[PDB]
Amino acid sequence: TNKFTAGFQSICDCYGIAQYREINAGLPTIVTFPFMFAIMFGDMGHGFLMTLAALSLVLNEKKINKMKRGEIFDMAFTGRYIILLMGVFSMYTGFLYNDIFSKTMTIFKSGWKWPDHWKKGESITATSVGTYPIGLDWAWHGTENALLFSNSYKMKLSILMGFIHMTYSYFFSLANHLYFNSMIDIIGNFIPGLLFMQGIFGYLSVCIVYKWAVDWVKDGKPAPGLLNMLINMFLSPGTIDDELYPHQAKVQVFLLLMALVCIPWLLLVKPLHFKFTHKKKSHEPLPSTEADASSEDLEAQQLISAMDADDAEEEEVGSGSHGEDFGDIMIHQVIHTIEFCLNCVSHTASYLRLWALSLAHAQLSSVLWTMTIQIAFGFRGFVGVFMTVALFAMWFALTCAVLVLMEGTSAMLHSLRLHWVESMSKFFVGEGLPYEPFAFEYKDMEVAVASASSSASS
Numbered sequence: 001t002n003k004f005t006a007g008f009q010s011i012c013d014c015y016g017i018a019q020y021r022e023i024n025a026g027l028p029t030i031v032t033f034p035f036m037f038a039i040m041f042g043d044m045g046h047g048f049l050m051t052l053a054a055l056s057l058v059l060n061e062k063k064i065n066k067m068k069r070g071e072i073f074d075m076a077f078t079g080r081y082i083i084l085l086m087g088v089f090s091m092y093t094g095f096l097y098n099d100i101f102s103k104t105m106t107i108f109k110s111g112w113k114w115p116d117h118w119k120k121g122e123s124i125t126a127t128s129v130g131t132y133p134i135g136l137d138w139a140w141h142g143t144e145n146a147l148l149f150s151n152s153y154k155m156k157l158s159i160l161m162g163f164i165h166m167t168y169s170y171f172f173s174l175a176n177h178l179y180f181n182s183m184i185d186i187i188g189n190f191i192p193g194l195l196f197m198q199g200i201f202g203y204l205s206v207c208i209v210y211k212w213a214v215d216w217v218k219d220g221k222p223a224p225g226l227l228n229m230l231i232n233m234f235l236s237p238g239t240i241d242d243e244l245y246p247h248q249a250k251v252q253v254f255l256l257l258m259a260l261v262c263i264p265w266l267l268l269v270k271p272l273h274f275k276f277t278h279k280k281k282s283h284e285p286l287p288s289t290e291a292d293a294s295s296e297d298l299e300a301q302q303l304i305s306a307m308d309a310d311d312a313e314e315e316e317v318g319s320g321s322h323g324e325d326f327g328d329i330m331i332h333q334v335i336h337t338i339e340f341c342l343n344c345v346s347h348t349a350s351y352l353r354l355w356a357l358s359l360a361h362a363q364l365s366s367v368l369w370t371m372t373i374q375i376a377f378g379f380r381g382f383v384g385v386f387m388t389v390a391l392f393a394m395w396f397a398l399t400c401a402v403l404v405l406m407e408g409t410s411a412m413l414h415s416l417r418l419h420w421v422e423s424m425s426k427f428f429v430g431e432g433l434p435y436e437p438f439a440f441e442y443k444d445m446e447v448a449v450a451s452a453s454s455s456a457s458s
Contacts, residue, residue, distance in 0.1 A: 008454045014444045016424030016432030018173065021181035022455030026437075026448020028172045029423045030082075032165075033445065036415035037086045038093035039158065039358045040408045043101045043365035044372070047094015049401055054087030078443050086412070106147060106366060110134035115144030139217045151359070156225070158358045160212070162351030163205035166422065170197045170347070173426030179285065181457075186285040188272035189337065195261035197344055203254055204229055210246045219245060262341070269337045273330030274318035275310030282311070282329075340430035343421075350422050357411045364407065368400040416445070 004012065004019060012018070017025035042049065057080040064073065076083070094101070105113035111132035117123050120136050122145035127133070135146035142153020174194060179186030204225070211225050222228050228247070236252040243250035275281040280298070283289045289298075312318030312330070321327020323334035375393035379386050416437065424432025437445035447454070 004458075005454070010435060011444075011447060011454045012428060013433040013435035014439060015437050015447050016420070016428040016435070017448065017455075018176040018182055018427050019455060020183070020458040021176045023450055023453045023457040025173070025176050025427055025455075026445075027450070029419055029427075029437075030085075030446065030448040032168075033412075033416055033419050033423070034082070034086045034089040035093070036354070036419065037408065037412045038090040039161070039354055039415060040090065040361045040411045041097050041101075041154075041358055041365070042090075042094045042404075043104065043106075043362060043369050044397070044400075045098060045102060046365055046401075046404060047091050047098045047101065049404065050087040050090035050094050052087075053405070054084050054091060057081075057084040057087060060084075074442050078446060082443070082446050090408075100144075101365075104150075106369065108132040108145065109147045110149075111145045111147065112150065118144045139215050139223050141211075141223065151363075154359050154362055155355065156208070158355035159225075159351070160205065160208045162355055163201050163208060165354065166347055166351050167197070167201045167205065169419070169422045170201065170344075170426055173423060177426045183285065184287045188269055188275065188285050188333075189265070192261075192265040192268040193341075196265045196341055197347075199258050199261040200344060200348060203251075203258070207247065214246045221247070265341050266337065269333045271310035271313060272333045272337075273310075273322050273327070274312030274314070276329040277317045277321040277327045278308065278311035278314050280308050281314055336430055343425070343431065347422055347425060350418050354415060354418055357414055361407065361411060365400075365404060368404070372397045372400065 008019075012022060015026040015029065017029075019025075037050075038047075041047070057076070060076060060080050061084065064070075064077070067073070070076075073079070099116060100112065103112075103114040103116065107113045108130060111129075111134075115123050115132075118136070120133075122133055122136050122143065124133050132145050135143045135149040137143040137146065137149065141149070141156035143149045146152070174190070174197075176182075178190055207229055208225050211223065211228070214221070216223065232251055232254065236249070236255045239252070240256070241249040241252045247254075272285075275285065279288065279294075280301075308314045310318060312320060312322070318327060318330050322330045324331055372393050375396055376390055420437065421431060426432075438447065441447075443452075446452075
């Protein structure tokens with residue numbers, strides 16, 4: 001039966017998108033993968049530069065006139081429409097952190113030339129400015145007046161954003177891998193899945209939030225969040241006690257709870273195994289009840305008896321059709337789930353990359369800024385040499401951009417891949433599908449778009 005149209009079938013493979021909430025299924029991606037480009041930040045005006053690019057792309061939208069056909073054209077039309085979106089998204093966090101690119105300006109190295117003047121009078125201009133008060137936020141992560149704990153600002157920033165990204169990624173496509181829009185009611189993986197991921201991303205972000213919710217000088221509990229959670233892995237004394245104040249021993253019961261939210265994504269998938277061979281149970285997670293011949297069988301079956309639990313659990317086979325032997329899902333799940341949950345570890349190491357990418361990007365541009373400026377200010381006692389030499393600086397800023405874009409692409413790609421595993425890891429199975437965003441026509445990252453949607457929604 002030519003059910004899901006194959007042109008469409010391979011599409012539910014191309015962006016790795018949920019073939020039943022599909023019209024929207026690539027779309028979070030098509031926004032947020034661009035928002036990831038912005039995770040590649042800036043430091044001069046950059047973001048501004050993403051606007052500058054965005055300009056030629058707008059003109060391109062009107063009508064390319066020099067040659068409407070072309071090599072760079074395929075990279076630049078639709079190839080540029082996605083890029084316009086990017087030049088803009090990256091304009092935007094390139095503008096939100098242009099707040100700090102245009103008014104960081106690096107020199108106080110445990111400062112920012114111009115902080116976004118911190119609360120603690122950080123910019124004590126009475127003292128020597130060079131060593132501005134070195135941080136002052138260390139029961140915190142970032143400082144307007146700290147470039148080393150700017151490394152902490154962005155580091156933990158992106159880390160947090162990471163928890164948001166991963167969670168959001170688990171969730172948009174948690175709900176899009178909510179087999180309902182898709183496969184009516186998968187209980188087997190949706191719920192006990194929510195729980196595990198809720199434990200990693202959640203409790204730890206409850207932690208980053210709590211870090212971002214107690215200036216722990218009155219209350220202690222460490223400012224490397226790792227210094228609060230990688231004590232968690234033995235922290236509890238094996239006595240049930242609770243919080244009196246932010247995660248004291250909300251974490252002590254977090255352990256007992258943590259075993260509870262990992263174990264049923266493995267254990268509840270035992271029921272997937274059990275469930276599939278006899279169809280009625282399988283049905284409670286899946287759309288599968290749709291046949292007419294099935295209804296005759298069901299009508300007889302109801303009259304004659306009634307004992308169903310997930311089919312091995314029904315007492316029939318699902319253990320007699322398990323994890324390896326027979327009864328495929330029952331095979332499958334142990335392969336998949338056992339990997340998948342632990343590739344939620346890899347989803348954990350996913351964001352870290354995102355963190356890194358950005359940490360690094362930001363530093364890079366920071367350096368680049370150092371070189372441009374490095375070219376300009378000094379001299380020898382020849383003014384004529386100054387008026388002249390500044391041109392090479394601006395050509396250097398010209399080089400910087402090419403490099404920026406280049407790395408930016410790579411990163412964007414990296415972020416693509418961060419979505420490739422991550423977006424998709426929820427969107428068209430636990431990892432998705434390798435028929436890549438695009439892999440054929442130069443826009444199937446873009447293929448998420450409705451006007452092309454080769455899915456109605458399905």
